[PDB]
Amino acid sequence: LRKTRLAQIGTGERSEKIRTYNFPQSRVTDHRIGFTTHDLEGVLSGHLTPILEALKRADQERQLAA
RNA sequence: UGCCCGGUGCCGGAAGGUCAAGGGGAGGGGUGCAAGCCCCGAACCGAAGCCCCGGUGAACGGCGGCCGUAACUAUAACGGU
Numbered sequence: 069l070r071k072t073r074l075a076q077i078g079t080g081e082r083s084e085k086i087r088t089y090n091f092p093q094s095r096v097t098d099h100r101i102g103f104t105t106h107d108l109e110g111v112l113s114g115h116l117t118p119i120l121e122a123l124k125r126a127d128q129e130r131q132l133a134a
Numbered sequence: 135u136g137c138c139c140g141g142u143g144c145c146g147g148a149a150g151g152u153c154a155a156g157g158g159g160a161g162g163g164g165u166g167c168a169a170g171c172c173c174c175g176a177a178c179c180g181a182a183g184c185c186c187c188g189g190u191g192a193a194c195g196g197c198g199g200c201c202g203u204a205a206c207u208a209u210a211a212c213g214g215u
């Protein structure tokens with residue numbers, strides 16, 4: 069349970085970031101897939117289904133052998 | 135060579151409370167014609183000891199429980215009771 073958490077949380081530094089929420093520019097970027105939206109008020113309210121599907125896509129595009 | 139004198143010890147305290155023999159004798163009782171003889175007896179006075187108020191540990195001795203809380207987990211300097 070510990071080695072697995074540190075595989076996810078790490079040190080918690082500013083880097084190691086997975087997804088930035090920039091309020092001044094109403095932007096929400098997810099750096100693993102190259103996806104950004106601008107519905108920040110909607111993202112921080114629950115409408116995350118866009119980014120998840122966008123993540124699932126690159127995951128299925130990842131599972132391409134060989 | 136720390137903290138606890140509530141308990142036991144010892145030390146201190148001419149106040150107060152309790153307190154024995156004794157002092158005292160309100161008031162009774164036995165008997166006798168009686169003078170009387172005999173008995174009981176309340177208040178009150180009346181030590182040490184004990185109570186009571188203090189002190190005291192290189193005197194007898196005693197020196198907690200539960201619950202929470204910090205940049206991963208853990209722990210908990212910290213908080214509550």
Ligand SMILES: [Mg+2]
Nearest residue numbers: 135136191192
């Ligand atoms: Mg000692």
Ligand SMILES: [Mg+2]
Nearest residue numbers: 138139140141
């Ligand atoms: Mg003591």
Ligand SMILES: [Mg+2]
Nearest residue numbers: 139141142190
């Ligand atoms: Mg003592």
Ligand SMILES: [Mg+2]
Nearest residue numbers: 139140188189
């Ligand atoms: Mg004492």
Ligand SMILES: [Mg+2]
Nearest residue numbers: 144145146147
């Ligand atoms: Mg004394």
Ligand SMILES: [Mg+2]
Nearest residue numbers: 154155156157
């Ligand atoms: Mg006598």
Ligand SMILES: [Mg+2]
Nearest residue numbers: 155156157158
């Ligand atoms: Mg007497």
Ligand SMILES: [Mg+2]
Nearest residue numbers: 156157158175
């Ligand atoms: Mg007498």
Ligand SMILES: [Mg+2]
Nearest residue numbers: 156157158159
């Ligand atoms: Mg007498």
Ligand SMILES: [Mg+2]
Nearest residue numbers: 163164165166
């Ligand atoms: Mg007569």
Ligand SMILES: [Mg+2]
Nearest residue numbers: 153181182183
């Ligand atoms: Mg006395």
Ligand SMILES: [Mg+2]
Nearest residue numbers: 141142184185
């Ligand atoms: Mg005593």
Ligand SMILES: [Mg+2]
Nearest residue numbers: 139140187188
């Ligand atoms: Mg005492």
Ligand SMILES: [Mg+2]
Nearest residue numbers: 141194195196
């Ligand atoms: Mg003791």
Ligand SMILES: [Mg+2]
Nearest residue numbers: 142194195196
């Ligand atoms: Mg003992």
Ligand SMILES: [Mg+2]
Nearest residue numbers: 204206207208
């Ligand atoms: Mg923690």
